Amino acid sequence: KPHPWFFGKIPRAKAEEMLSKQRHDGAFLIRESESAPGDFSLSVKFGNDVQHFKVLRDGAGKYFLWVVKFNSLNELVDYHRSTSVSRNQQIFLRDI
Ligand SMILES: NC(=O)CC1NC(=O)C2(CCCCC2)NC(=O)[C@@H](CC(=O)O)[C@@H](c2ccc(C(C(=O)O)C(=O)O)cc2)/C=C/C[C@@H](Cc2cccc3ccccc23)CNC1=O
Ligand SMILES: NC(=O)C[C@@H]1NC(=O)C2(CCCCC2)NC(=O)[C@H](CC(=O)O)[C@@H](c2ccc(C(C(=O)O)C(=O)O)cc2)/C=C/C[C@@H](Cc2cccc3ccccc23)CNC1=O
Ligand SMILES: NC(=O)C[C@H]1NC(=O)C2(CCCCC2)NC(=O)[C@H](CC(=O)O)[C@@H](c2ccc(C(C(=O)O)C(=O)O)cc2)/C=C/C[C@@H](Cc2cccc3ccccc23)CNC1=O
Ligand SMILES: NC(=O)C[C@H]1NC(=O)C2(CCCCC2)NC(=O)[C@H](CC(=O)O)[C@@H](c2ccc(C(C(=O)O)C(=O)O)cc2)/C=C/C[C@@H](Cc2cccc3ccccc23)CNC1=O
Ligand SMILES: NC(=O)C[C@H]1NC(=O)C2(CCCCC2)NC(=O)[C@H](CC(=O)O)[C@@H](c2ccc(C(C(=O)O)C(=O)O)cc2)/C=C/C[C@@H](Cc2cccc3ccccc23)CNC1=O
């Protein structure tokens, strides 16, 4: 499990300066959080800036960027038109 995407204590500013010069949107790194001891931040090139996400943890110690839950069945459906419903195959929802 190589982690060439991990850049340790790279400051937020330097991560932005590095990601700015990348050719593709989605170019990214993970780095230690600026403020939170033991936490990680994900930095991603998107168009003409760089977005930062906190790498969230739950009580079981799992890692995630947002909790994927929906307010309506329709919302669930709309999501899985473009994100697979299967955990092992590529299967998108399509109108019957
Ligand atoms: N990186 C991956 O894609 C790995 C797996 N994850 C999935 O397919 C995923 C994530 C991507 C989108 C589809 C759903 N998620 C899951 O399957 C899930 C569960 C699910 O139903 O979606 C993942 C999981 C279970 C429980 C928690 C929970 C907790 O630990 O208390 C919590 O809230 O923190 C969290 C996550 C189960 C893994 C068991 C896995 C089976 C398993 C593997 C190795 C060891 C054990 C040991 C015990 C039980 C099961 C396993 C199935 N899941 C995967 O292999
Ligand atoms: N996984 C995610 O980041 C999803 C969220 N983020 C967003 O909605 C985003 C998604 C990218 C586009 C802008 C909006 N990002 C942000 O809002 C932000 C905004 C930003 O970039 O300033 C994201 C963030 C804050 C600060 C850092 C910082 C550090 O960790 O000390 C660093 O650069 O190392 C990094 C990231 C804030 C999270 C606060 C979050 C609250 C929070 C959660 C857990 C621990 C702490 C701890 C302290 C403060 C807040 C939190 C709310 N935001 C989100 O959950
Ligand atoms: N959650 C995961 O599955 C990630 C890792 N775990 C493993 O592959 C596993 C997990 C179960 C089977 C044995 C090997 N574990 C390990 O490799 C290891 C260690 C090992 O040989 O078991 C994992 C580790 C280090 C130290 C502790 C712990 C203790 O020693 O009691 C403590 O509190 O210090 C616990 C775990 C090292 C991680 C660094 C990793 C390298 C690393 C170092 C520093 C920063 C980063 C940042 C991002 C990714 C990886 C790293 C190697 N380990 C992994 O990638
Ligand atoms: N719990 C502790 O306080 C002692 C450990 N942790 C630290 O000192 C810490 C404590 C908070 C602030 C930064 C320094 N944390 C860390 O070092 C780190 C990473 C860091 O720089 O923040 C800890 C770590 C690695 C990877 C993950 C990873 C995963 O499990 O997938 C993830 O986040 O998803 C998570 C944590 C690395 C352990 C390797 C350890 C070295 C190591 C041991 C055994 C096998 C391998 C194998 C490969 C690389 C490193 C190691 C170093 N860390 C520690 O022993
Ligand atoms: N993780 C916890 O919160 C505590 C668990 N305690 C245990 O007894 C354990 C402690 C380690 C030694 C074996 C048994 N853990 C487990 O049962 C399992 C580990 C195990 O070997 O059975 C634990 C677990 C699941 C999946 C993974 C997986 C992943 O997330 O990708 C992976 O290995 O990569 C890792 C760990 C969680 C299961 C769901 C838990 C139930 C659950 C909650 C929320 C959503 C789902 C969704 C699907 C299935 C189960 C759940 C039952 N397990 C536990 O409560």
UniProtKB/Swiss-Prot annotation:
Homodimer. Associates (via SH2 domain) with activated EGF and PDGF receptors (tyrosine phosphorylated). Interacts with PDGFRA (tyrosine phosphorylated); the interaction may be indirect. Also associates to other cellular Tyr-phosphorylated proteins such as SIT1, IRS1, IRS2, IRS4, SHC and LNK; probably via the concerted action of both its SH2 and SH3 domains. It also seems to interact with RAS in the signaling pathway leading to DNA synthesis. Interacts with SOS1. Forms a complex with MUC1 and SOS1, through interaction of the SH3 domains with SOS1 and the SH2 domain with phosphorylated MUC1. The SH3 domains mediate interaction with RALGPS1 and SHB. GO terms for molecular function: ephrin receptor binding; epidermal growth factor receptor binding; guanyl-nucleotide exchange factor adaptor activity; identical protein binding; insulin receptor substrate binding; neurotrophin TRKA receptor binding; phosphotyrosine residue binding; protein kinase binding. GO terms for biological process: actin cytoskeleton organization; B cell receptor signaling pathway; branching involved in labyrinthine layer morphogenesis; cellular response to ionizing radiation; endodermal cell differentiation; epidermal growth factor receptor signaling pathway; fibroblast growth factor receptor signaling pathway; insulin receptor signaling pathway. This is Growth factor receptor-bound protein 2. The chain holds residues 56 to 151 of 217 of the full protein. Ubiquitinated by RNF173, leading to proteasomal degradation and inhibition of the RAF/MEK/ERK pathway. In the nucleus, polyubiquitinated by RBBP6 at Lys-54 at DNA damage sites. Non-enzymatic adapter protein that plays a pivotal role in precisely regulated signaling cascades from cell surface receptors to cellular responses, including signaling transduction and gene expression. Thus, participates in many biological processes including regulation of innate and adaptive immunity, autophagy, DNA repair or necroptosis. Controls signaling complexes at the T-cell antigen receptor to facilitate the activation, differentiation, and function of T-cells. It is found in: Nucleus; Cytoplasm; Endosome; Golgi apparatus. The gene is GRB2. Keywords: Acetylation, Cytoplasm, Endosome, Golgi apparatus, Host-virus interaction, Isopeptide bond, Nucleus, Phosphoprotein, Repeat, SH2 domain, SH3 domain, Ubl conjugation. Belongs to the GRB2/sem-5/DRK family. GO terms for cellular component: cell cortex; cell-cell junction; centrosome; COP9 signalosome; cytoplasm; cytosol; endosome; extracellular exosome. There is a cross-link at residue 54 (Glycyl lysine isopeptide (Lys-Gly) (interchain with G-Cter in ubiquitin)). Residues 5-96 form the SH2 domain. It comes from Homo sapiens (Human). Signal peptide: none annotated. Its main location: nucleus. The modification N6-acetyllysine is found at residue 54. Changing residue 54 to R: Loss of polyubiquitination. The keyword RNA-binding does not apply.
